[PDB]
């Protein structure tokens, strides 16, 4: 018979129980491996993972069944790979997708023989598998439990360990030689749903106020229909409805869904033009879950850098034909104690008059001074101090927050959103310590309950002990019943469920439904074209903005970029790394405030140098272009730039 199944396999060991020989008994599983499971498994797919766990568990004795388990695959590779893009088999029918469970269901795919066998043919089948016949298996795949996830979380990952390092790839083979990237593009979503809910998102990310030149061009076109119908949304979740916008929980986290031996070896520079511009040949940006955050930023930096290039490509065109003034930089004007006013209103001229120039790279000017990388820490110290009144602090956790009584200086959140939007463009960190709920809200997801322990842990357990146990809570001294007549509600616990939800919707949304939004208006003004909702997870936007404390001084001693007086065997160069590597518990934390100007690390971090020569830094490039003397001269000169903080 063609399809071998539950009762035909019931007596395979019984038919060789008396003769002990199994030669055509294993040929048939190398025949039923080549669509034939469908009639072999049915009583919208089969449920026979218990049934193979009656096969393989009664065939625990014969470990020669794994021969034709694997030997069927070698002809099964070009079987299911040609018929999908040349014959397009599942286009007409939704029943071609029922076969796919046979590859993943084996309990010994974790062994390296099935590593190079089971995935890459099947990922090739999963590659041209369509939007549903990938995306609807995930609905079946998320139903798998955590141990089944634990059996799955390794088995697709195990090829992504070694296939990506079999390629010692050049700039010629990025995506075409990687192929089970597109497998992992799908089966990442297994750990998405297997909490996620599309309910509690933000309101709509409103568009920028249009360019007044394009505003008249909006009288040259229709002005009413194509108002950003494509922000280049992710396509997989449009085949779902349920998104990566709102991954509240995993079963196993998404750092499992990152490969660092993949990350360095790839080409990521043109990957944004393998993303915005399309290229099937060389892509990984189209699977933004798999990039490391310290590498994901590069293309995001590049999308700005390409826009800066395109703003360098558009700065001509008013000194070109209009003959007028030329801004090949975003020139911003401030004063060191008249910043917050003049930081803002210059950008308002870059808002109502030139709403293009903000993606263009920032170059700050002053009034008195006759520089940008240090400039943000100047901004975000006075911004993130409560001298302006925008902000509180949860200094116990050292996590930062808006002040809800910034009812007028939400006009001064207008600056920082552009600034935060500009802090991500130059690829600088901020020493902003915002909680995770900011970045869920920066990715358009309004406050859940569980993000409160990021923001305010003293509210977190004090709102879930209610669950562990009246229905109104004050806010700073103003008591406010969320639910109406929440004052009179007793400590009856049936009501309390929304009281978890509403007070979490209060302090995260119903307090700052305009505060953060007037903040996010400045943010999304300059960061709309950036694919941060696409590339960055909300956790990825954290470590972009807030930065990582992996202070690796032992990087930029190896990848420094100095010229004009600092060759490889320079004397102070052969005397400086021993200074930065002579560090103790505090000398580390004071190093970076002088070089770049920050406290946490953004391995693409670099250096620059040339030729009482104290510690000097051109503080917009991490450029310590100091002079040539010995160690014991320089033993305190670095401190002298750092002592007077």
């Amino acid at each position: 018979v063609t399809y071998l199944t539950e009762e035909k396999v019931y007596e395979i060991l019984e038919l060789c129980r008396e003769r002990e020989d199994y030669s055509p008994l294993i040929r048939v599983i190398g025949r039923v491996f080549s669509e034939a499971l469908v009639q072999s498994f049915r009583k919208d797919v089969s449920v026979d993972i218990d049934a193979i766990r009656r096969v393989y568990t009664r065939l625990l004795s014969n470990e020669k069944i794994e021969t034709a388990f694997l030997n069927a695959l070698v002809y099964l590779s070009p079987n299911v790979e040609c018929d999908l893009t040349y014959h397009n088999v599942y286009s007409r029918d939704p029943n071609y997708l029922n076969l796919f469970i046979i590859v993943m269901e084996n309990r010994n795919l974790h062994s390296p023989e099935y590593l190079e066998m089971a995935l890459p043919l099947f990922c090739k089948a999963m590659s041209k598998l369509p939007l549903a016949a990938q995306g609807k298996l995930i609905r079946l795949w998320s139903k798998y439990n955590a141990d089944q996830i634990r059996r799955m979380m390794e088995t697709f990952q195990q090829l992504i360990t070694y296939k990506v390092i079999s390629n010692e790839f050049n700039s010629r083979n990025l995506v075409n030689d990687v192929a089970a990237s597109k497998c992992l593009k799908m089966v990442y979503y297994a750990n998405v749903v297997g909490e996620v809910d599309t309910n509690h998102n933000e309101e709509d990310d409103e568009e920028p106020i249009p360019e007044s030149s394009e505003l008249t061009l909006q009288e040259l076109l229709g002005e009413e229909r194509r108002n950003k119908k494509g922000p280049r949304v992710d396509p997989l979740e449009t085949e779902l409805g349920v998104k990566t916008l709102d991954c509240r929980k995993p079963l196993i986290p998404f750092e499992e869904f990152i490969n660092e031996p993949l990350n360095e070896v790839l080409e990521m520079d043109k990957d944004y033009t393998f993303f915005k511009v399309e290229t099937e040949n060389k892509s990984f940006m189209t699977c933004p879950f798999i990039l490391n955050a310290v590498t994901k930023n590069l293309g995001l930096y590049y999308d700005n850098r390409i826009r800066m290039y395109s703003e360098r490509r558009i700065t001509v065109l008013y000194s070109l034909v209009q003959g007028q003034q030329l801004n090949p930089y975003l020139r911003l004007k401030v004063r060191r104690d008249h910043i917050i006013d003049d930081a803002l209103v210059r950008l308002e001229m870059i808002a109502m008059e030139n709403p293009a120039d903000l993606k263009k790279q920032l170059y700050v000017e002053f009034e008195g001074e006759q520089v940008s990388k240090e400039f943000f820490q100047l901004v975000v110290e006075e911004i993130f101090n409560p001298d302006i009144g925008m902000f509180t602090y949860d200094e116990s956790t050292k996590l930062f927050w808006f002040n809800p009584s910034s009812f007028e200086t939400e006009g001064q959140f207008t600056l920082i959103g552009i600034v935060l939007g500009l802090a991500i463009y130059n690829n600088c960190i901020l020493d902003v310590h915002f909680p995770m709920v900011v970045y869920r809200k920066l990715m358009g997801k309004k406050g859940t309950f569980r993000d409160l322990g990021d923001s305010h842990p003293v509210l977190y357990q004090s709102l879930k002990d209610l669950l562990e146990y009246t229905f109104q809570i004050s806010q700073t001294p103003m008591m406010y019943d969320l639910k109406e007549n929440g004052d009179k509600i007793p400590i009856t616990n049936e009501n309390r469920k929304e009281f978890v939800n509403l007070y979490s919707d209060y302090i995260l949304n119903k307090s700052v439904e305009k505060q953060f939004k007037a903040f996010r208006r400045g943010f999304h003004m300059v960061t709309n074209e950036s694919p941060l909702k696409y590339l960055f997870r909300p956790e990825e936007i954290e470590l972009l903005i807030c930065g990582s404390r992996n202070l690796d001084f032992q990087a930029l001693e190896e990848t420094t970029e100095y010229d004009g007086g600092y060759t490889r065997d320079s004397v102070l160069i052969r005397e400086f790394w021993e200074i930065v590597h002579s560090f103790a518990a505090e000398q580390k934390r004071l190093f970076l405030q002088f070089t770049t100007g920050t406290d946490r690390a953004p391995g693409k971090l670099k250096m620059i140098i040339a030729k009482e020569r104290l510690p000097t830094s051109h503080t917009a490039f991490n450029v310590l272009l100091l002079p040539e003397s010995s160690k014991e001269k320089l033993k305190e000169r670095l401190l002298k730039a750092i002592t007077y903080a």
């Binding site: 394009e214 040259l220 494509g230 280049r232 915005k276 511009v277 399309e278």
Partner: protein, 131 residues
Amino acid sequence: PQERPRKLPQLCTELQTTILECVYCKQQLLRREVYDFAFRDLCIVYRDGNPYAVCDKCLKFYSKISEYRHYSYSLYGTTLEQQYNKPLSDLLIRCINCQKPLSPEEKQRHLDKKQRFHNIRGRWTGRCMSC
């Protein structure tokens, strides 16, 4: 609004003339710029009721304005019909260089160059026969 003719093929009638002023150049146009406004099919620009046109020097500029700035994404021929499943004749695609609405025969300008179609300002574009 709905009454004012947003196409010069209809404004030649409602001017009660025979087969031209742009607001960018602020000048009076010509009959070379009445064929292409009937051929690039752009919208008539209005100045709170005052209707004007484009000139080609400001068709070649103020669309050059957006295409190097309002760029969103460009995609293969394998996808622009896939993710839309909208007819290429119905597919509202203009030109990226001259803002001429692409004839579907001229939608082989990227389909039959092994090229890709472009989208500026969320309003898809590409190359045409003149380019």
